[PDB]
Design a binder for this molecule. Structure first.
Ligand SMILES: *[C@@H]1O[C@H](CO)[C@@H](O[C@@H]2O[C@H](CO)[C@@H](O)[C@H](O)[C@H]2NC(C)=O)[C@H](O)[C@H]1NC(C)=O
Ligand SMILES: *[C@@H]1O[C@H](CO)[C@@H](O[C@@H]2O[C@H](CO)[C@@H](O)[C@H](O)[C@H]2NC(C)=O)[C@H](O)[C@H]1NC(C)=O
Ligand SMILES: *[C@@H]1O[C@H](CO)[C@@H](O)[C@H](O)[C@H]1NC(C)=O
Ligand SMILES: *[C@@H]1O[C@H](CO)[C@@H](O)[C@H](O)[C@H]1NC(C)=O
Lengths: 224, 212, 317, 163
């Protein structure tokens, strides 16, 4: 059936330029109005750009006017978004969407249409930070039946993956969303609750994998 | 520029209940040209309604849209566990603009958090800084308030936190709060405390440690 | 004093001409094109599965012409017959060549299944220098040239049931010797005869001796015939000479498969409409490129432009 | 009217006034949006996809064959003549109706305005109204935004009109 597949995001420094692409399968791109819609992490949906089936008009949101140009390639049935002069506020996952209604659109204030099909997204991280590997530190146990975990501090960029005993331990595990420190580096925590009479006999190893930096760390957690 | 204003911030309802979300506009749309999107976490949004009342192909009969002019609503007749997600609305009466989104969560029963506090790791402090962590484990509802107090000195501006998504079994939240300090400031004081207040606690619960 | 309020509409310096029921030419503010008239120039390898025949025709590939052996067990959505295609095997001809090419192209698969035929009394795997494969003589890979064994060519009466749940296409042939000398020297009888038949259907060819124009050395020929066997139905081959036996069957399918003749190169891109002139976008309702079409396409029309007025009448001063 | 205003670049229909304060030009949006909405729906009907067709018949040939080739040719020729006429008729109707609907949209904007100024104005025949009362930039925009009351200027406008 009909499919949208976006391509070409990544970590890139502020001010620089970057082109995103959206492959259309299942329909002719020239027969539809095509949109870009983005979503900053945790935030909500924001419309960004539109190109008529014509290729004849283009309209942009004020937050990107001047800097973002939207284009189509009839010949490759592909849709592009040329981003210039990027900045940290632009950091989002960028969706490609199809519009079965908008056909004629000759002013920036006329009616458009709804988004029929959506791609799955490509992530644009705009930051000055350089690729750092995480430093994994323990969170020792002290209750009824206590808890432990790993602190994964100062890494860039997302994502890391955490597991416990290489996947053997899933129930009772919470791995929190990574927060951006003011340093520009990420940091998160993973914790787990376990039987307290078992601390002396069972072993708990958290497995931290951050492949943007080819870092992989196995640290153990234990009282005192 | 038409602005789209959704209410409430978060919904919460028990499964099987009827939901009803609101979307109001800064002007008149222009033909009820108002759409509704559902977006589960980690997924692209999927279209539910267009022209304010028309179901999209392959959308169950329980989602219904209504409204005209300025005030629109989305009604979910019965709430199945698949329906807990963020709901945005979008107008195309003039250009295209999105609402801010209404998360509908599961309303379970009140759950007190379980509090844990973790002094910094020995390895960390010989690299200049020290992190103090606080765990708020499996609570409901989401609204909680943590406060750090170093030697009963109310702390501000140096701690961050994150919250997990509503758990898929017990429908609870968990919260992690990290107090970044310098090594320098850390060996000045002794009593490090994390004070939690939450609907499921009669009086605030304080977990703490002395240094050594 | 007083006030004056004027109403009006916009206009533009240069508008576009369009046709209406009365007026042949009439300026409006904008118009769009309803007739697609251009082609990239190349055929797109997606979403359709395009098979470039290169130097092979579909029939050669079907039959087993040596340089078309790469096309064995092959499948296509659209088979593309280049114009540089030649035959380099035994000089053949197919009665109803058009129908064979079509019925195969629609089936979209050369998936062949060899079968255990038993030709007691004759010498299998005949070959020729008009059909070189490797170091010496050879033949069509999907056909068995049967000739006399010893001083004898017994009457062949073999049968093959169809016990699967699909349809079997069989390709076989008959041989036309240039002379009587060649006739008896190969198939000891003086006049051959092949009768291939199912339960409901029957056909039988008598060979025809005589000189044809010299092609790749030979002045004799092969005539290619086919037979389809439905489930439960059964094939019966009966011949006392000149038979070109089937080694087995092609599987028959029904789908959106076809064949097209075109010299446009194939490229890696997307497009749902294919013409001999290359792929074209089917955004507009009509096209003027080629009446020959494959896939979701605008309808071929004679006009090269039809402007749809996309605005009001344009009146300047 | 008389002709159009190349200087209008923000809409399709609109007003131009001359007053006490100056002379202004503002485009009406709803009527523009109505004409655009139609022409748009139109497009949606014509671009509305195509028909899938795969294995057909052959339409080019290398050799003379008589009867069957003749038929195969005539069939395709007939088809093309028929879809050609259909295409030629389609744009003609769609365009006549397009033009028809866009000047009708003017005559409902003008008729909307006349019903506002009940009898505080007369129509010159120009595509314009002579307003018989003081009317600043705030007053005509009350006409534009549809928010104009005639009983206010009624006593005033009936005067200049009748003597
Ligand atoms: C006719 O349609 C074309 C588009 O098909 C319009 O061209 C655009 O006009 C805007 C400004 O009005 C430019 O910023 C765009 O870049 C133009 N795009 C192209 C592809 O030309 C044209 O304005 C229309 N004509 C009228 C009179 O409205
Ligand atoms: C040629 O081969 C066929 C084999 O198919 C022979 O026909 C069979 O005859 C017997 C009775 O003698 C039937 O019971 C079988 O069912 C027939 N086979 C079928 C229907 O496939 C036939 O006898 C052979 N002819 C000669 C001259 O040997
Ligand atoms: C072709 O395919 C059939 C079944 O898929 C198999 O039996 C046969 O051996 C294959 N032959 C070649 C040459 O791939
Ligand atoms: C397409 O090819 C035909 C014949 O091959 C030719 O007559 C016609 O002009 C071509 N159309 C193009 C290249 O647009």
């Amino acid at each position: 059936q009909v499919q949208l597949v976006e391509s070409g995001g990544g970590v890139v420094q502020p001010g620089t330029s970057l082109r995103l692409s959206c492959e259309a399968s299942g329909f002719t791109s020239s027969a539809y109005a095509m949109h870009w819609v983005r979503q900053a992490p945790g935030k909500g949906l924001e419309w960004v750009a539109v190109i008529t089936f014509d290729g004849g008009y283009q309209y942009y949101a004020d937050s990107v006017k001047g800097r973002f140009t939207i284009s189509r390639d009839i010949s490759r049935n592909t849709l592009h978004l040329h981003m210039n002069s990027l900045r940290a506020e632009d950091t989002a996952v960028y969706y490609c969407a199809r519009d079965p209604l908008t056909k004629l659109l000759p002013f920036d204030w006329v009616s458009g249409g709804y988004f029929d099909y959506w791609g799955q997204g490509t992530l644009v991280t705009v930051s000055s930070a350089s690729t750092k590997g995480p430093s994994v530190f323990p969170l020792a146990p002290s209750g009824g039946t206590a808890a432990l975990g790993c602190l994964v501090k100062d890494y860039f960029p997302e994502p890391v993956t955490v597991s416990w005993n290489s996947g053997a331990l899933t129930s009772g595990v919470h791995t929190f969303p990574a927060v951006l420190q003011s340093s520009g580096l990420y940091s998160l925590s993973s914790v787990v609750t376990v039987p307290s009479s078992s601390l002396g006999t069972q072993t708990y190893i958290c497995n931290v994998n951050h492949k943007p930096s080819n870092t992989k760390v196995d640290k153990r957690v234990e009282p005192k | 520029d038409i602005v789209m204003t959704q209410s409430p911030g978060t919904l919460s309802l028990s499964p099987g209940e009827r939901a009803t979300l609101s979307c109001r506009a800064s002007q008149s749309v222009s033909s009820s040209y108002l759409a509704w999107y559902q977006q589960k976490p980690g997924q692209a949004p999927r279209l539910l309604i267009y022209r304010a009342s028309s179901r999209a192909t392959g959308i169950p009969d329980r989602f219904s849209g209504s409204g005209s002019g300025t005030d629109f609503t989305l009604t979910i007749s019965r709430l199945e566990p698949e329906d807990f997600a963020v709901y945005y609305c979008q107008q195309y009466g003039s250009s295209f603009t999105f609402g801010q989104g209404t998360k509908v969560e599961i309303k379970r029963t009140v759950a007190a958090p379980s509090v844990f506090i973790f002094p910094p790791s020995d390895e960390q402090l010989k690299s200049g800084t020290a992190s103090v962590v606080c765990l708020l484990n499996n609570f409901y509802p989401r609204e909680a308030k943590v406060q750090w107090k170093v030697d009963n000195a109310l702390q501000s501006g140096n701690s961050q936190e994150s919250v997990t998504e509503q758990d898929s079994k017990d429908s609870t939240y968990s919260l992690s709060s990290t107090l970044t300090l310098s090594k320098a400031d850390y060996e000045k004081h002794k009593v490090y405390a994390c004070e939690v207040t939450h609907q499921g606690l009669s009086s605030p619960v304080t977990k703490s440690f002395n240094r050594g | 004093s007083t006030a004056t309020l004027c109403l009006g509409h916009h206009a533009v310096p240069n508008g576009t001409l369009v046709k209406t029921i009365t007026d042949d030419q009439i300026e409006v503010t904008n118009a769009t094109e309803l007739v697609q008239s251009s082609s990239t120039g190349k055929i797109c390898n997606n979403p359709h599965r395009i098979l470039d025949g290169i130097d092979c025709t579909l029939i050669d590939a079907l039959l087993g012409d040596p340089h078309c052996d790469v096309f064995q067990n092959e499948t296509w959505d659209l088979f593309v017959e280049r114009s540089k295609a030649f035959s380099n095997c035994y000089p053949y001809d197919v009665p109803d060549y058009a129908s064979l090419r079509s019925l195969v192209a629609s089936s979209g698969t050369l998936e062949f299944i060899t079968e255990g035929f038993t030709w007691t009394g004759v010498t299998q795997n005949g070959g020729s220098n008009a059909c070189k494969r490797g170091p010496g003589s050879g033949f069509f890979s999907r056909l068995n040239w049967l000739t006399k064994s010893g001083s004898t060519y017994p009457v062949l009466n073999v049968t093959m049931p169809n016990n699967d749940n699909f349809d079997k296409l069989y390709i076989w042939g008959i041989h036309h010797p240039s002379t009587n000398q060649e006739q008896t020297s190969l198939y000891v009888q003086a006049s051959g005869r092949v009768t291939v038949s199912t339960r409901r259907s029957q056909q039988t060819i008598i060979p025809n001796i005589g000189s044809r124009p010299w092609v790749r050395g030979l002045s004799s020929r092969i005539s290619i015939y086919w037979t389809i066997v439905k489930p439960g139905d059964v094939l019966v081959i009966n011949s006392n000479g000149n038979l070109i036996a089937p080694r087995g069957y092609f599987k028959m399918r029904t789908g959106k498969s076809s064949i097209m003749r075109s010299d446009a190169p194939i490229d890696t891109c997307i497009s749902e409409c294919i013409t001999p002139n290359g792929s074209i976008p089917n955004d507009k309702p009509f096209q003027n490129v080629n009446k020959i079409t494959y896939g979701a396409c605008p309808k071929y029309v004679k006009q090269n432009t039809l402007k749809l007025a996309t605005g009001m009448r344009n009146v300047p001063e | 009217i008389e002709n159009g205003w190349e200087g209008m670049i923000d809409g399709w229909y609109g007003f131009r006034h001359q007053n006490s304060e100056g002379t202004g030009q503002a485009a009406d949006l709803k009527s523009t949006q109505a004409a655009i909405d139609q022409i748009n729906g139109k497009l949606n009907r014509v671009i509305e996809k195509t028909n899938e067709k795969f294995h057909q018949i052959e339409k080019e040939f290398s050799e003379v064959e008589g009867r069957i080739q003749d038929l195969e040719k005539y069939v395709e020729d007939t088809k093309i003549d028929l879809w050609s006429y259909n295409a030629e008729l389609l744009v003609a109707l769609e365009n006549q109706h397009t033009i028809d609907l866009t000047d009708s949209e003017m005559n409902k904007l003008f008729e909307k305005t006349r019903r506002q100024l009940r009898e505080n104005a007369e129509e010159m025949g120009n595509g314009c109204f002579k307003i018989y009362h003081k009317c600043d930039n705030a007053c005509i925009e009350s006409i534009r935004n549809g928010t104009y009351d005639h009983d206010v200027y009624r006593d005033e406008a009936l005067n200049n009109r009748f003597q």
